[PDB]
Amino acid sequence: ESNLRKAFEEAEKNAPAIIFIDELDAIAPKREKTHGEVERRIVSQLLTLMDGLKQRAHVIVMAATNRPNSIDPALRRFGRFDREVDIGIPDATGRLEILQIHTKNMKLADDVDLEQVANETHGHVGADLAA
Amino acid sequence: RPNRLIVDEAINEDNSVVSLSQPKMDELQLFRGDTVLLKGKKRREAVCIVLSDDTCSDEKIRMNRVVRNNLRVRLGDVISIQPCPDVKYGKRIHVLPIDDTVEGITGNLFEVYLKPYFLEAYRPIRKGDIFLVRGGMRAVEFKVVETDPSPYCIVAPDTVIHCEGEPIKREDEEESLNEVGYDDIGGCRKQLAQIKEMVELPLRHPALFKAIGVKPPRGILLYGPPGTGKTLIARAVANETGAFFFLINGPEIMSKLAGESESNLRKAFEEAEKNAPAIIFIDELDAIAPKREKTHGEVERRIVSQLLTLMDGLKQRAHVIVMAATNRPNSIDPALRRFGRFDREVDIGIPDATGRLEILQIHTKNMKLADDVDLEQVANETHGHVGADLAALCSEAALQAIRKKMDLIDLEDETIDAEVMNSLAVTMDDFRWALSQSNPSALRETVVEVPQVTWEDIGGLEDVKRELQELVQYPVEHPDKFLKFGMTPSKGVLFYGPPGCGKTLLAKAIANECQANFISIKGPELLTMWFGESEANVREIFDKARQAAPCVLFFDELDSIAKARGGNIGDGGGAADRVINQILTEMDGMSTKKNVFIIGATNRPDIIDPAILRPGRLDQLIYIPLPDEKSRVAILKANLRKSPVAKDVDLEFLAKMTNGFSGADLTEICQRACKLAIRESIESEIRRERERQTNPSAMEVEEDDPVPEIRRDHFEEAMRFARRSVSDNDIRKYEMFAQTLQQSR
Amino acid sequence: ESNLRKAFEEAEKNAPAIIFIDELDAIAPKREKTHGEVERRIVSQLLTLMDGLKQRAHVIVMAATNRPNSIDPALRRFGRFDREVDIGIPDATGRLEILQIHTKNMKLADDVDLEQVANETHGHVGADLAALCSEAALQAIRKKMDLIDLEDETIDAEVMNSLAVTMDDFRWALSQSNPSALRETVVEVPQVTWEDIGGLEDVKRELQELVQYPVEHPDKFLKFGMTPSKGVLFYGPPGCGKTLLAKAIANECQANFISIKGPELLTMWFGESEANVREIFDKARQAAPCVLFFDELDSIAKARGGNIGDGGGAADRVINQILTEMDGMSTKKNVFIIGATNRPDIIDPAILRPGRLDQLIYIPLPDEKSRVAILKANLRKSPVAKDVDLEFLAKMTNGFSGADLTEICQRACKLAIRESIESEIRRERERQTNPSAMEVEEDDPVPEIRRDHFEEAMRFARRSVSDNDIRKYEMFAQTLQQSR
Ligand SMILES: Nc1ncnc2c1ncn2[C@@H]1O[C@H](COP(=O)(O)OP(=O)(O)OP(=O)(O)O)[C@@H](O)[C@H]1O
Ligand SMILES: Nc1ncnc2c1ncn2[C@@H]1O[C@H](COP(=O)(O)OP(=O)(O)O)[C@@H](O)[C@H]1O
Ligand SMILES: Nc1ncnc2c1ncn2[C@@H]1O[C@H](COP(=O)(O)OP(=O)(O)O)[C@@H](O)[C@H]1O
């Protein structure tokens, strides 16, 4: 918990800052999945820390997760995380721009049909194309 | 004692107005424009202008918050009133704002605030007074630092106004006129009054309860959806009444390390005692006191037991009351519901259209809306939202209006200008845009309200209307003759007949007429509790129905379980039996005192088990005849309220062609005709724009949008490709079963 | 537990003493329901401490709980808790007495009907009545705040002497009230007398001989080796003095009464399946010699294979549990069991066995003079029909049930009430529409049943009872006819 507290206080000394936290479901699941006690303390501490962020400074916090269903509903009230943005799977065109970005340095020969590859690569993601 | 009056709320928004009953002010020689000096405790004095009021009693005085704080007084206090018509116009007055108002403000406060606020105002002002001016979207404070003549002076067109000087520092004896109050809540009037009196009785006269000896309530529970201002209500009540409100947060409690946690509670209880009578608010009780089966460890049970011991051991001493808040009054452990514990429970329902309108009115007070607001439209179309939703919507609309102003505010400066800010306004397009990027939070929940369906919306059934009046209005309006006869009014009425005849419309109309709350239950959710979740929900549903007394619980598609009783599956006998048991046990268990009525509706009277059909149960039965002749005409009139006009063909003629048709069929006919009219308008507009564009950018004559001009053509076409969906076999079956049940009973 | 130990070590060393335990079930739930480890240690320590203090000793133990079964059963051996005392909710007499107790110092005005309130506040507790008294006093004080010294400090306790309460304050307090018992079994002697029922004098005599007779002269019963059967069944048309009969006989016997109907049985069908009749019969057995009533007993027989095609679950479970529990009734306690049915043909003969429910009684339809007496009983009310006292119309009511007669009477009463409402409304809006030309208020002749009500009631005459049901009843009676 101290570390979390540490993070927050640093933002207080460091102007409007962005606080990004990753894999919330791994640390903030539903109470049904919670079998031990320490996780409850962690969730309560983080909720208290973030709810006390009223005014303070112009610090914005966002989180990364996979499924809002896996997230505990208590972290859905007003003043807490309310803005919701989803990132869908890109189409063939988006695959094309991703390939164009990743192939900027490469010396492609005069046989490359990026559009054809993008069409053939349905069901992939950015990491897939990078690899 | 015609010298002292008890203060209460004010209906006038001016800072120098007092409302009195006419005879009382006549006795004390008080009339319009009469300057009066008011003196109270703290050796504080003020000067005000007398105004009249009807609802204000002689002993009471309507007067607002600003002078309440100026006089350092709360509600119910007695004041010394003296007509003092010796005032003189001011000459040179130095006035300054408070320190916490000019932050990033700059500009000229004079021409924007002082100049308009003091135009033809003639406010009797006194040295040391403080007042507020509503800015473009903020609130500005101003305290006079010196006046001439002192201390009595009327603001006059000939004054030497000194606005120069540093904004004075905030006084620390009393905070300010910025925090919450009774004037900042909307949509909870009845419960607000209840809580207000239940806390005003102990918190104003503790010695009265000390001498009397009664036990004041020791715990009050509030339950409702999150973000409905429950904490706001508690804090506002505490601040207005005068106490030592000491909030405790649930989530931070178990965030501590074992025993220390509950020690905090103990410490809180300690500061509860030696701090005079005060109020304690506890939030998220379920987070700290869930159900017994929910608990898995031992720290949780120890915490719950510690809290129970602490609160039970509190027997009077300091006049301390406990306010608890929760989402739903079912997740809390039952043991904390007994006598000597939280017993008085209050619901915080979702605000209606009127509640939404008044809350939005409250939230937009500081801002400077454009002169195009249709607040009623927004309020009615934003159903399913809470106070937080409305506040967020207003904030977003203001922000977007600001954003579409960057040309004037291109980087502006680190110290913004007040004149530019006050020169802006928010239009309805901003509100619609904010609505576009908006999402309600209520969504899936029950709704309770008194509908607006009127009797004239349905043609015919005058005997049915009379019977409903007899069975609803009569018992409530004059129970005296009922008790003089001893006859017990029935509670069970059922409707049967052809579907789509607006039986639900009749239920809504009678609920509107009785001016009681309406609750609807539909067959889908009935089947939803038929499987999956058990019958337990029904229980609290009745409680909710019993909570909203007087109310009319409505059931639609009551034969759905009967349809599952005999159908293409016929395998849910146990679940159907459980449903029947639960509903019967709930309905027969209600007290005859409650002004709660039950209405059942179905179109399959032949399949309903007569187990429900019994005295002491749903026993009254009404058949709904199909629409006929003039009734259809009335229906043809009712759905013609709408908006368009079709003054080409007789409605009675169309009723003559549509003889023996269902009312829903008539509504479908009207809908199809209006669809054809919409298609005609669309194609005409498309043709006119096409002919205006084929001609190069031709704006020669604008073809005005045609007035609704539906001919016999559209009506005839609709009648052609639409017929009476109900066949005569259904009618004959209904009538034969009706006669069989008529002569079999 | 050290403090508990401390308590014990100070309990005996302080002369004869009494020890009370508050909310015992919170300390000793069932063993399986325990989840941690400290609670088991506490329970075992408590058991050891309380068992080890036998010696000579002078300390008695008090333990209070809500659910007797919720506690751990192990602490019920001899030396441990063995004697149980149930504290049920009071009755109207008890409610009135408690109200008197709480209001013994009240300077109430002589306008309150405590009896009416007590009858009105059924399903409450002593705490509820105390709260009602407190809030009534608060309302009375609130209605007269203005004159008392609210402006000054608290009253010198002499103005409050002038204060008084009203029954209207009590009604207002009752409006803002909430009972707590609600869903709770009721054990009491009913008040239905034999005057409430007409006809079936032979049936009444037979019931008397079955139930009353054994208690007065058991000497001849044991001399002849007679053990009266504990069980009877009723069959007949619905709504024909069935619950009324049980209430009347229980009242005459002046014993407690317990009822349960088919909806409850089907509630225990699924959900809380079984494990419920046991505690009900235990409650009856520990209770005073009383009567148990089983309404809609055929419901399970109606539900086992009737019209839905159920899953074959509680259909046998409930019946087997009931039979096993009643077979455990080894005389001694003089509690009787009564069952009611309307479709006895579906009942399996397992219950219809000697030792089990064996006595069978058919309930016929009322017979004119019986119908007349029933109507008179229903016609206590208030209005009186002078000219036509429902005689020739009563003659033509052949084939109707008592429920039908009650329905007709209620319809007539409500229509007369409607007539009074409309007449009074006519009078009043005529009085206000006219500029107060007339203001006299003479009582209308409504509180007297008039003949016109009789015709308008008989026009909507209801033939509720079907002769097919009667013929089915009689053919089934001949099917089980005692005369071969
Ligand atoms: N009736 C109301 N009138 C005005 N504003 C309201 C009302 N209800 C809610 N609000 C607004 O919602 C917010 C109140 O948030 P708050 O944290 O106090 O919620 P709550 O309903 O009291 O409880 P909880 O936070 O536990 O859900 C404020 O922005 C307030 O303006
Ligand atoms: N004045 C009226 N009289 C009869 N029916 C109407 C009237 N106004 C509307 N209706 C029709 O009644 C329908 C609602 O009937 P409802 O009470 O839902 O019956 P059901 O529940 O059997 O469908 C609406 O769809 C509407 O088309
Ligand atoms: N003296 C009487 N003789 C016959 N029936 C009566 C008499 N008094 C009342 N009743 C009716 O008998 C009914 C008793 O109900 P009950 O017979 O138990 O219904 P069910 O047979 O459907 O269970 C009451 O509803 C009442 O209307």
Author numbering:
A (entry chain B): 283 to 413
B (entry chain A): 22 to 766
C (entry chain C): 283 to 766
Q: Which passages does the manuscript contain on this structure?
A:
Endoplasmic reticulum–associated degradation (ERAD) maintains protein homeostasis by retrieving misfolded proteins from the endoplasmic reticulum (ER) lumen into the cytosol for degradation. Transitional ER adenosine triphosphatase (ATPase) (VCP/p97 in vertebrates and Cdc48 in yeast) was identified as the primary energy supplier for ERAD and has been shown to power the defolding of ubiquitinated proteins via its interactions with the heterodimer Ufd1-Npl4 (11–14) and the deglycosylation through its interaction with N-glycanase 1 (15, 16). In humans, Derlin-1, a homolog of yeast Der1, was found to form a tetrameric channel with a central tunnel ~10 Å wide, indicating a protein channel mechanism for retrotranslocation.
To further investigate the conformational change upon the ATP hydrolysis of p97, the DerΔ-p97Δ complex was supplemented with the nonhydrolysis analogs ADP·BeFx and ATP·BeFx before cryo-EM analysis. In the other conformation represented by 20.8% of the particles, however, the Derlin-1γ/δ interface is disrupted by displacement of the p97 NTDs, resulting in a “U”-shaped structure (state U) with a large opening toward the lipid environment of the ER membrane. Nevertheless, the overall shape of the electron density and the C-terminal domain (CTD) associated with the p97 NTDs enabled reliable modeling. This opening, formed by the crevice between Derlin-1γ/δ, measures more than 30 Å in width. Notably, resolution of the Derlin-1 part within this open conformation is limited likely, due to increased local flexibility upon loss of the rigid channel structure. An unexpected discovery was the conformation of openDerΔ-p97Δ/ATP·BeFx (state U). Here, the pulling action of p97 NTDs tore the Derlin-1 channel at the side wall to form an access between its central tunnel and the ER membrane, likely allowing the retrotranslocation complex to capture large protein substrates, such as partially unfolded proteins with some secondary structure retained.
